[PDB]
Amino acid sequence: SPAHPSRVRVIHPGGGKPGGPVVYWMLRDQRLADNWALLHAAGLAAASASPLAVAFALFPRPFLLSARRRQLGFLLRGLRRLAADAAARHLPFFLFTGGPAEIPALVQRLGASTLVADFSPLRPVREALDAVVGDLRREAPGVAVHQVDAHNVVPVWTASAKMEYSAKTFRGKVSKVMDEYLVEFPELPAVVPWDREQPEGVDWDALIARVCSEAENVPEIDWCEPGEEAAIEALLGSKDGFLTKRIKSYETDRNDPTKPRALSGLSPYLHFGHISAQRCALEAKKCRHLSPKSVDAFLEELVVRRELADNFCYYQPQYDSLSGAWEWARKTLMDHAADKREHIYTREQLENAKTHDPLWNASQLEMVHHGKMHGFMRMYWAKKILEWTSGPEEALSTAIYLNDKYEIDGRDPSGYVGCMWSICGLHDQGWKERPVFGKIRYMNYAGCKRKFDVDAYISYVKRLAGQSKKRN
């Protein structure tokens, strides 16, 4: 296939007889363009003179990692667009709302030769893949199952053979093979027309209303549209695309929460796979000569950091718990477990932004009402939760709960890793020992005041919350 073999993990070789359909079980990478898993499926189909189908399984209530209206609405409106693009291309798109068990069911009805899955290190996804593999192993051992890393530039199992200590050590490994993997995408190979079972028609308006009303009412975001088309516009649009109109000031503005527009705004799209991270990297390379320092800094966050989070979650099964932190960090947090905290807030008080700290309150409200807290503020926000709760495990649990509830880009390896960086020093060095934090990196209000106009950020969030509360 068009996919580099290192991107392809053959889970089960299969056998039986070729000529059977190839099915791409789409999960993490909700796009037709720049998708190695789809390209691999199409390549298998084309080579065996067999038809090609895409299937998507929505996890039913309580939904994947407790997705709320906000996240469900974005995913489904994105999939509605994708389904339309699929039909225009005569690529069959099967939508299953009962759960992943429908995937093996379909594979058997169609007499599929191969199932291709994409890759995520998150435990509920890995467990669902494993269960599907087991179902097929027992009922259709002739069916081949392949998994393709379509999300990372460098395949997760190839980038490193182990969980890496930090961005530095991870960069050392990936920079060596970056030229081999940061390459263009070919077009989908042509495949014979689909002549098998036809996907059932979806009433998307009915489905979206149903699913979202079954989930907690965290409101949909209104400031960007989901899907491939809107994602490419966010990256490359002539009017206000990131790489076209905003890349220049990135290295010097990305840490300034009073410059909301300096960030790429790509994480919503990258999380749902509406846009390929490799696509974003390729386009950045094409404009590096115009803004070398900023592009280099962008590529560091986009490739090294993001992929380091996949590395961690893939190799560390306890990626959302204190036990998953490094020994130095666990010990320093334990050493300071008995230190009296200056403030203790409950989860409810934090969630509703009822602390003595107006900067922290602002960061919480930005997440609640806007759905995307400024990247610099996420570090401050999570560190205060450590400072104002009874212990690091409770802090970690609360940060993750809030992040996953409110962020449009949440329920993501990078969310778990962000909280772990903040609270447990994951991928960080140690610093001067102090009460509560021990050697975990400390940040404070005074430190923020030196760097940027804190009152301006506070005012900006107040205005956002106001509009959001009125709209609600």
Ligand X SMILES: Cc1cc2nc3c(=O)[nH]c(=O)nc-3n(C[C@H](O)[C@H](O)[C@H](O)COP(=O)(O)OP(=O)(O)OC[C@H]3O[C@@H](n4cnc5c(N)ncnc54)[C@H](O)[C@@H]3O)c2cc1C
Residue list for the binding site for FAD: 250, 264-267, 301-309, 372, 403, 409-411
* Sequence-distant (≥ 6) Cβ neighbours of residue 341 within 8 angstroms: 387, 388, 389, 390, 436
Which of 222, 246, 220 lies closest to 233, judged by CA?
A: 246
302 binds ligand X (CB under 6 A): yes
271 binds ligand X (CB under 6 A): yes
379, 401, 430, 453: which one contacts ligand X (CB under 6 A)? Answer: 379
Q: Which residue has the tokens 């666990």?
A: 330
Residues in the chain: 472
410 binds ligand X (CB under 6 A): yes
Shortest Å, Cβ 293 to ligand X:
14
- Look at residue 73 and give its three-state secondary structure: helix
Tokens of 377: 């503020």
Rank residues 29 and 407 by Cβ distance to ligand X and give the closer one: 407
Residues 336-375, interacting with ligand X (CB under 6 A): 375
The H or E element containing residue 53 is strand 52-57
256 binds ligand X (CB under 6 A): no
Beta strand 144-148 pairing with 8-12? antiparallel
Residues 414-433, interacting with ligand X (CB under 6 A): 414-415, 417-419, 421-422
Shortest Å, Cβ 404 to ligand X:
7
The neighbouring-strand residues paired with 22 are 52, 114
Rank residues 93 and 388 by Cβ distance to ligand X and give the closer one: 388
In angstroms, what CA-CA distances link 464 with 52, 255, 375, 406? 46, 20, 17, 15
- Look at residue 95 and give its three-state secondary structure: strand
33, 110, 382, 454: which one contacts ligand X (CB under 6 A)? Answer: 382
Shortest Å, Cβ 207 to ligand X:
25
Tokens of 440: 């975990």
Maximum Cα–Cα distance for the chain, whole Å?
69
397 binds ligand X (CB under 6 A): no
Rank residues 146 and 271 by Cβ distance to ligand X and give the closer one: 271
246, 305, 384, 405: which one contacts ligand X (CB under 6 A)? Answer: 305
Rank residues 156 and 309 by Cβ distance to ligand X and give the closer one: 309
236 binds ligand X (CB under 6 A): no
**What one-letter code names the amino acid at 16?**
G
Shortest Å, Cβ 364 to ligand X:
12
Contact 34, 174 (CB under 8 A): no
Residues that bind ligand X (CB under 6 A): 254, 263-267, 270-271, 301-302, 305-306, 309, 375, 378-379, 382, 403, 407, 409-410, 412, 414-415, 417-419, 421-422
